[PDB]
Amino acid sequence: MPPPADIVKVAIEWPGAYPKLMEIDQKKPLSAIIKEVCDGWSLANHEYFALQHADSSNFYITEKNRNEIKNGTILRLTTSPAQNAQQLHERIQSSSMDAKLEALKDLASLSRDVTFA
């Protein structure tokens, strides 16, 4: 029954964002944590970004995968899995070539993400 350590001192990043380390509580809905992170990086439009582990996963933090936020695991905020999916419709089907190739290596790396899937 009892919850794990919710108060967790984790790094929170966004590609290009210098991490700021707080005592994040995991109980509140992830919309609020993403909200505070995004406002910290001056980001509105919270639903279009989802945190992700800076682990080798690159897997986006939804409610399914935030019990993997352990002390010291860097959080790397980035586009939410739906936004990554739309990005991929436009940069996987398009007529650009290098963009398709790199975006498709991204899509291959990201297919393992059930949250993105």
């Binding site: 001192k9 984790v10 790094a11 991490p19 700021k20 380390l21 707080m22 002390n71 010291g72 860097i74």
Partner: protein, 181 residues
């Protein structure tokens, strides 16, 4: 209000976070703090001048060195905490701590802190170190580190006795407010 990013560096099990939690939160951590790194803020006065401290409790691990070296930028004073009970932590300050804080911040002032000055005389620490073939860091030894690695001052603290804690961090601040010559 003037802030100083005082990234407190120093090995594991030597007393960074003990000194900080005795300073920012005024408690002596019972057990070796599992540290990645933290952000605090207190209200301290330095030789009659009150100052703001936004502090950083960096890790002593070899593992998250990339994150701790991300912390070194924006730092204005480097507090290196090494155990007097464990002068191998002093040797690590000589090999990695001061060198890495300087490679990430050259000429940015460094305080040198000898944690556990209360153990230079405690029987357990002396007997343990003599059984380890080393002696607790004498103030001359830490001062030799300070002269060698250009520390602004070599202080000593005892978070167990709450010794020098506020003094340690005020000196860290005045390493920047009043640059040492």
């Amino acid at each position: 209000m003037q802030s100083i990013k005082c990234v407190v560096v120093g090995d594991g099990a030597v007393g960074k976070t003990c000194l900080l939690i005795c300073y920012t939160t005024n408690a002596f951590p019972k057990e070796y703090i599992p540290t990645v790194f933290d952000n605090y803020s207190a209200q301290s006065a330095v030789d009659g001048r009150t100052v703001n401290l936004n502090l950083w409790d960096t890790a002593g691990l070899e593992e998250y060195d990339r994150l701790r070296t991300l912390s070194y930028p924006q730092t204005n004073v480097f507090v290196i905490c090494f155990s007097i009970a464990s002068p191998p932590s002093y040797e690590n300050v000589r090999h990695k701590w001061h060198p890495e804080v300087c490679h990430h911040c050259p000429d940015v002032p460094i305080l040198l802190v000898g944690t556990k000055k209360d153990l230079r005389a405690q029987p357990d620490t002396l007997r343990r170190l003599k059984e380890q073939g080393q002696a607790p860091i004498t103030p001359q030894q830490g001062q030799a580190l300070a002269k060698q690695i250009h520390a602004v001052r070599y202080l000593e603290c005892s978070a167990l006795q709450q010794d020098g804690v506020k003094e340690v961090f005020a000196e860290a601040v005045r390493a920047v407010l009043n640059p040492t010559p």
